[PDB]
Structures are given as structure tokens and as C-alpha cells.
Design an enzyme around this catalytic site. Sequence first.
Site, PDB file in Angstrom:
ATOM      1  N   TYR A 131      86.233 -58.239  44.648  1.00  0.00           N
ATOM      2  CA  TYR A 131      87.188 -58.591  45.695  1.00  0.00           C
ATOM      3  C   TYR A 131      86.776 -59.882  46.409  1.00  0.00           C
ATOM      4  CZ  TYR A 131      90.364 -54.531  45.826  1.00  0.00           C
ATOM      5  OH  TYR A 131      91.335 -53.556  45.598  1.00  0.00           O
ATOM      6  N   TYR A 132      85.482 -60.106  46.599  1.00  0.00           N
ATOM      7  CA  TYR A 132      85.047 -61.379  47.179  1.00  0.00           C
ATOM      8  C   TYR A 132      84.719 -62.425  46.113  1.00  0.00           C
ATOM      9  CZ  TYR A 132      84.618 -58.840  51.612  1.00  0.00           C
ATOM     10  OH  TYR A 132      84.844 -58.059  52.726  1.00  0.00           O
ATOM     11  N   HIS A 166      97.619 -64.269  43.927  1.00  0.00           N
ATOM     12  CA  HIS A 166      97.885 -62.867  44.228  1.00  0.00           C
ATOM     13  C   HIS A 166      97.008 -62.423  45.385  1.00  0.00           C
ATOM     14  CE1 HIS A 166      94.508 -62.505  41.261  1.00  0.00           C
ATOM     15  NE2 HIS A 166      94.199 -61.399  41.911  1.00  0.00           N
ATOM     16  N   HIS A 172      95.293 -58.837  46.895  1.00  0.00           N
ATOM     17  CA  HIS A 172      95.028 -57.403  46.883  1.00  0.00           C
ATOM     18  C   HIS A 172      95.129 -56.900  48.315  1.00  0.00           C
ATOM     19  CE1 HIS A 172      93.190 -57.618  42.741  1.00  0.00           C
ATOM     20  NE2 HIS A 172      92.848 -58.829  43.133  1.00  0.00           N
ATOM     21  N   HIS A 220      93.294 -64.157  45.771  1.00  0.00           N
ATOM     22  CA  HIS A 220      92.670 -64.779  44.616  1.00  0.00           C
ATOM     23  C   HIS A 220      93.655 -65.737  43.962  1.00  0.00           C
ATOM     24  CE1 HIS A 220      90.251 -60.770  44.127  1.00  0.00           C
ATOM     25  NE2 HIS A 220      89.716 -61.549  45.043  1.00  0.00           N
TER      26      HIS A 220
END
Length: 295
Positions: free
Chosen positions: A18-19, A160, A162, A149
Site C-alpha cells: 500500500y505504501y 487508482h 485503494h 498509486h
Amino acid sequence: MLDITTITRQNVTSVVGYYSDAKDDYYSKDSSFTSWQGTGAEALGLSGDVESARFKELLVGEIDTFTHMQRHVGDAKKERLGYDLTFSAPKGVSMQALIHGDKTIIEAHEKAVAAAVREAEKLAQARTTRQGKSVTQNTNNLVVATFRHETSRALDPDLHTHAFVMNMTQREDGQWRALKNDELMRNKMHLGDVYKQELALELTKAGYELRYNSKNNTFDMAHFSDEQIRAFSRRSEQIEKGLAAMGLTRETADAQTKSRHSREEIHQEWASRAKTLGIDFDNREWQGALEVLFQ
Ligand SMILES: [Cl-]
Ligand SMILES: [Mn+2]
């Protein structure tokens, strides 16, 4: 486009990037790519960038040193941690933003996600009891951590976010309990349409002409074509996967297969690929039709 993925104890390692998936992104080099959203986040005093330690505590239900959710009735491997609502821009919008450039497109996408998250809060429900009977309650609050991202796993341009909806909501009695997710899950098309509607409005404010597809209720940038986008995706896959032409002999097929990391170098490949297909990203701003208005 909106996909929903349930994150459980069993598949939690699927969020490990995620990061790091944003590491070399253009529009978050010196800028935030995360945010806290939702009325529940406000209730918890969370705003701005998502600190990973706090994300991880809420992921497992640690609301504070004195408030720890217990949600797993049964096999703890199946405990739900949250719901990844992944909002992706149309591919041509992504190509425009990440090959030509315009931070306004990134801001339009993030406004559209935030609008869809506000609408998602209206679907938040929790269980409680009245007279010993289980009942359902509308709670109107979610705790959401967003992660933007720029690229897909195959290193295509693919903007996109999340929007990670924690498996929690605050009941009327003030208690934090698991999200009853039924209404969220069955409104995936509504939330995706809210995203699309807000994205189209924000792109119109910025002067981009959009082309509309009525059958699928979708749109994209009008100044290059669906056929051009499809050809760009085909060529991208050739390079990404190292696909070769067929060989008339085993020896030729072997040799062709055998033959076939900076974001700057990746960007050049994108740009060259688009040029060879006759894509011209220099649109005539504030000119053209308004096909997506009133849709
Ligand atoms: Cl222009
Ligand atoms: Mn991603």
C-alpha cells in the site's frame, strides 16, 4: 471502475505494497498520496496522511489503549479486517495524466473518490439487540484510509486509489462494532457511478473533452480513440511479458523468445509507444462537445 476486495487475516499480506507501490510515483514525490476519510475517521481524530502504525492498529480493531474490538466469531483466520474499494480511472485519463501530465487530473480523481466515500457512508450498518432480538442499525459513519498509486503491477499507466474501509462503524450507543457489509457490497455499481459522475464533472471543469459510451455508461478522453487505447495496451503487454512472434523452426522460436527500472525510462517507453500509434495528448482545452453532461 470500482472493484471491492475483502481483506481478512488470511490474505492480509496482500496489502503489503500500500505504501511501497507509490515509491517512484510522479505526483507524490513531494506530496501526499494517502488520506483519512469518513465521519468515523473524524470521530477518531484522524485527518491528513495515514500513519502506518495507526492504520495497522485500526486494521486489527485496536481503537485505543482501552478499546479493542472482538469480531471473530469462530475461525480467526476468517476475521474481516476491512474492504479495499479500489477506484481506477479510465485508461485514457490515466494515460493523459501519466504520459503528458496535469496534476489537475490527479486532484479530479481524488475528489471523485472522496465523493464516492461520502456516499458509501450512507450504507454503513451495524448489528445490535432490542428486546433480545438482533436488529440492524444504519450508522452513517465509516473509517477510511486511502492510498493512491499511479501504475499497475505490469507497469501500465493506471491511476487508482485503494479506499480501505475499516471493518468498524460507531453505533448510536457510541460503541464501535463490525460493519454489517451487505448494503455496501450490493451498491458497488452505485458507488462506481458516483465516482464516474464526479470525475467527469471535475475533468469538464478543467477543459477536457470526454467521449461517452451509453451501453456501458463509461467515458474516456475524447482526443484519442478506443482503438488507439486498445493498441497501446496490446503493445504494452508485448513488452511487459516479453512476447515474441512465432518461429517457423524450434531454433528460431527459441532465439526469438530468449531475446525478448527508472520511472523516467518507463515514461519514455510509454511516450514512444503512444507516439507510434498516432496519439496526440495536446488536447484543445475547453473546445469540443459535452457528451457526458446530463448522463
Ligand atoms: Cl492544449
Ligand atoms: Mn495499487
